[PDB]
From a paper:
[name] cooperatively assembles into helical filaments on uninterrupted RNA duplexes longer than a few hundred base pairs (bp). The helicase consists of two RecA-like domains, Hel1 and Hel2, and an insert domain, Hel2i, all of which form contacts with phosphate and ribose moieties of both RNA strands. The helicase and CTD, linked by a pair of α-helices referred to as the pincer domain, form a ring around the RNA.
[name] image reconstructions of [name] [name]-[name] filaments bound to transition state analog ADP-[name] produced two different structures of equal overall resolution at 4.3 Å. Both structures had clear density for ADP-[name] (distinguishable from ADP), closed helicase motifs, and intermediate helical twists (87–88˚), like WT-ADP-[name]-bound filaments. However, the commonly detected structure, Class 167k, with 166,554 segments collected, contained only 14 bp of RNA per [name] molecule, the same number as ATP-bound filaments but one base pair less than WT-ADP-[name]-bound filaments. We note that the dominant ADP-[name]-bound filament reconstruction incorporated three times more segments than the equivalent WT reconstruction, but this [name] reconstruction had lower overall and local resolutions and slightly broader twist distribution, suggesting that [name] filaments are structurally more heterogeneous or flexible than WT filaments in the transition state. A majority of [name] filament segments failed to expand their RNA binding footprint and retained the 14-bp footprint of the ATP-bound ground state. We conclude that the [name] mutation partially inhibits RNA footprint expansion of [name] as the helicase domains transition to their closed transition state. The twist distribution of ADP-[name]-bound filaments was also broader for [name] [name] than for WT.
Residue numbers in the entry: 306 to 643, 670 to 695, 699 to 716, 720 to 945, 956 to 1020
The structure:
Amino acid sequence: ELQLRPYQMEVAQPALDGKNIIICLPTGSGKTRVAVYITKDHLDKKKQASESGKVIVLVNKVMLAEQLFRKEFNPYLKKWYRIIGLSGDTQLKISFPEVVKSYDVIISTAQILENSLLNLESGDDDGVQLSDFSLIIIDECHHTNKEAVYNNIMRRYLKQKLRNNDLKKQNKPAIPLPQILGLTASPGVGAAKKQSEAEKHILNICANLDAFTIKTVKENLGQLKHQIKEPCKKFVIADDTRENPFKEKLLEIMASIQTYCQKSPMSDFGTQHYEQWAIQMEKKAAKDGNRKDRVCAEHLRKYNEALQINDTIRMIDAYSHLETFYTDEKEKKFAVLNDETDEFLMNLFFDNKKMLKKLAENPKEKLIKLRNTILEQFTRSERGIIFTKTRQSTYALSQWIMENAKFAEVGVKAHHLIGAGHSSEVKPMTQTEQKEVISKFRTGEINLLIATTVAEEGLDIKECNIVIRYGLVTNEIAMVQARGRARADESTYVLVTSSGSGVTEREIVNDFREKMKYKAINRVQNMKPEEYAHKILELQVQSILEKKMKVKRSIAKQYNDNPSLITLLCKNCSMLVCSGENIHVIEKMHHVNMTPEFKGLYIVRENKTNGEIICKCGQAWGTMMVHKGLDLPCLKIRNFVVNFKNNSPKKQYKKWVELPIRFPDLDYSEYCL
RNA sequence: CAAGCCGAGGAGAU
RNA sequence: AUCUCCUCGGCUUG
Ligand SMILES: Nc1ncnc2c1ncn2[C@@H]1O[C@H](COP(=O)(O)OP(=O)(O)O)[C@@H](O)[C@H]1O
Ligand code: ALF
Ligand SMILES: [Zn+2]
């Protein structure tokens, strides 16, 4: 019961035979269906040729594999060919390499394939080679960039093609190369002010994919323009003239402190510059081992973060933020006990804690304007999406909807969604839970979704009525793909932000960028095949040379692997904590210090199962990892400082890998008895 | 369900 | 060439 549309056939017509190419069309245009038709045709062709038919699909997002397998690929091609879908959630009880030759239609996340290839290179596992496949398909080709996943794969493919081209003039024997297909909407641009640079970017993409063409549609183009409707653009601007009372009280506290330790901002409050100088102050103070400098800088950084959320968020949230913060601080110090600097700071806070708590309840905003727009549009509808920067923002919006009685009066449903993985002060969602909330939305049980970048790509929905960004602009690709998800016959696109910032300017950029994309695409579609080949070959060669250079510099990077040359100190107090040798490793990942001569030092805490460690000052250090019955105390380099044996250059890495010198794996024979 | 390692991209600054 | 903030994927342990 497979179906196709005219423009679909037109755009794919080259690839139906040979022509490893790309496809560029707006969202929800049957790209997936195009791919499915091509898969079926390609395999049928292989069978009629008495030749092995292997296909594979690659998606950046884990959600997307399940989506494609569920709704598009498995249904149509189930009867004809075996199909299977893989991801991180899935368990490859068989393995990858084996299923490569079992199900004959693979769908997989990228890093899986790469991992198998890399293992093959290592020889640890049988692994897999490109030859095994006959047709490699891709989605969201735009990711194919300097060190992106896809690009790693393609770099291998390109290398092999160069070898085959070398053989072409040396020896008849050659190694097969699978046909490569590409599927995207916006190949995107590398932030090029000029359109010549943009067309160069495009050509770089094509070369990274052995494109031979972009091959967009022209003839049925009108049918598509009719078929697909663009949401009406809407600018929303709100200025934070109010909020002076509360914010200014806090700003005065900040000034008090910068004077309290001679902190010259050299910039304003409510930005990143201030944060970054605060961090550089922290760096300097650790290089000094001095207090009142990194600690005060860190507290000021916390305050600036509170302010910057205030720029877009209800102040109550910032008060809760810092309330929890200093709560933990007091708990740490009491646990340690069970100086003037911290005393000044904590008291300085608590002196205004309750008063500022009272202030936080006062009204007077962008949030109000957003509520108005949402309510109005929902009444107009008689589904909704929100994008913004931070998960915390999504939660705050959900609370704002929950508490505000007007939204209840409207009856609009709403729930927040955020990305999998833990991001430090947010409860990490679950892939399963993401599916749940998504279906709740797709079942009408949720009418107003909240999401981060993850939602911007894929997440195909039949029809969404409202799309509203809230103070979120990064790059045109993000914005355009976000607009694509509107998907309703009558769609609306909104963008909210302050008028002081250049956010609106960035929006206008992305508009101009969209224009430039076509301006360049039409310049390349109408290009010489020979000149096209020359440019693409040069770009592919350049990319491969760059990768080789990067590999060589990386190889020369880590060569020291010194056993014990150092001393690890606490960073608040420059107190000795460990030595170069007393450390040991487990899982070739973690580090630990047994030899309870260390144990005489550290302190423990736990509240709410791997308990946390803290210093004799109160500095946080690490966790108590349960491994093989042992409660090994594992520490994070991110919260300590170095001193070499010689010349004492104080340094700091945040990641053990940064450090070339090596430590040994633990031998339990020591701990016996 | 918790914790940890690595890689990547983009926003901002040098 | 380099630093900070937000997102993706994979890997391990409980
Ligand atoms: N042969 C066809 N005839 C009509 N509509 C189709 C056909 N194939 C796919 N579609 C439509 O295309 C949509 C899927 O588009 P898809 O390519 O998956 O989105 P995107 O292009 O954003 O990845 C479906 O909602 C379906 O209605
Ligand atoms: F391939 Al699309 F939106 F165009 F997921
Ligand atoms: Zn300490």
